[PDB]
């Protein structure tokens, strides 16, 4: 129970230069915002979303996969906590989506999500697009069932 001090230093762990630490901070913030929904936690969540946008602006594709596969259930946690912080989540989700789809377009692939549009161990951008659409599905099912 004496954990909610974490919101004091979660900005620092986000500002840490290591990718693994930034992923861990974002996941910790997600489960904190499930547990305690404070305006302090909301400000930290908004900071985290803008940080995630910044890393989207600046990260190459291999580390983009290695950073954006684990932190998407954190986004659905954010969206469960704060329905105000909702349009920002959807804008960031659509931006990460279409940039990964552009990568899939850049280099030749097989399973072809562009044809799959009307609905193992594969290529990283394929896995990332599948993760993105799965988290969108989870946001929608959440919001439907969540009263």
């Amino acid at each position: 129970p004496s954990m909610h001090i974490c919101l004091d230093f979660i900005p620092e762990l986000i500002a840490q230069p290591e990718l693994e630490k930034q992923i861990f901070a974002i996941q910790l913030l997600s489960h904190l915002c499930i547990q305690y929904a404070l305006p302090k936690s909301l400000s930290v969540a908004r900071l985290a979303v803008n940080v995630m946008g910044t890393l989207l602006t600046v990260l190459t594709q291999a580390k983009r996969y290695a950073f954006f596969m684990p932190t998407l259930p954190s986004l659905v946690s954010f969206c469960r906590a704060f329905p105000p912080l909702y349009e920002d989540i959807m804008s960031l989700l659509i931006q990460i989506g279409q940039v990964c789809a552009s990568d899939v377009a850049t280099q030749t692939r097989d399973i072809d999500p562009i044809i799959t549009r009307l609905q193992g161990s594969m290529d990283p951008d394929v896995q990332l697009c599948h993760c993105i659409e799965r988290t969108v599905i989870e946001i929608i099912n959440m919001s439907v069932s969540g009263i």
Partner: peptide, 8 residues
């Protein structure tokens, strides 16, 4: 008396 990462 170290409260954070040293370079930052």
């Amino acid at each position: 008396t170290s409260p954070s990462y040293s370079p930052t």
